Amino acid sequence: QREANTQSYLDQVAASTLEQLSNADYRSGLEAQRDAMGMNLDRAATRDAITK
Amino acid sequence: QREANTQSYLDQVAASTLEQLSNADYRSGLEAQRDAMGMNLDRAATRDAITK
């Protein structure tokens, strides 16, 4: 379940257009979703995702 | 729990603006927060975080 949760989050960032991620209001909410799942994710493989 | 503490610290440094880290007063407190948790962290993958 933890693995599935991690991939479910990562898909959202993977399926966003560059213009959206550039705007610093979409990414605020997008990374607030990962700050509310607590440690039910893999917080070491979902940190430098957006930028990457 | 130790792993959780490590990730929780690393997130703070990873979610800071470059201008904030450049100013040598924010990073003082930021790296003082890792000198009070003692050996309850991973002090090997935690020292050269601000510079990276």
Chain B contacts to A (CB-CB under 8 A):
4, 7, 10-11, 14-15
User: What chain B residue is nearest to A34 in terms of C-alpha separation?
Assistant: B11
CB–CB contact A47 B14 (8 Å): yes
The alpha carbon of residue A27 is apart from the nearest alpha carbon of chain B, in Å, by: 12
CB–CB contact A47 B4 (8 Å): no
Compute the Cα dihedral for B3, A39, A46, A27 and give only its sign.
negative
- The answer to whether residues A16 and A26 touch, using CB atoms and an 8 Å cutoff, is yes
Compute the Cα dihedral for B19, B21, B23, B26 and give only its sign.
positive
The angstrom resolution of this structure is 3.1
**How many whole angstroms separate alpha carbon A48 and alpha carbon B14?**
8
Compute the Cα dihedral for A49, B3, B7, B8 and give only its sign.
positive
- The answer to whether residues B16 and B52 touch, using CB atoms and an 8 Å cutoff, is no
What was the experiment behind these coordinates?
Answer: cryo-EM
**How many whole angstroms separate alpha carbon B49 and alpha carbon B52?**
5
Q: Count of CB atoms within 10 A of residue B49's CB?
A: 16
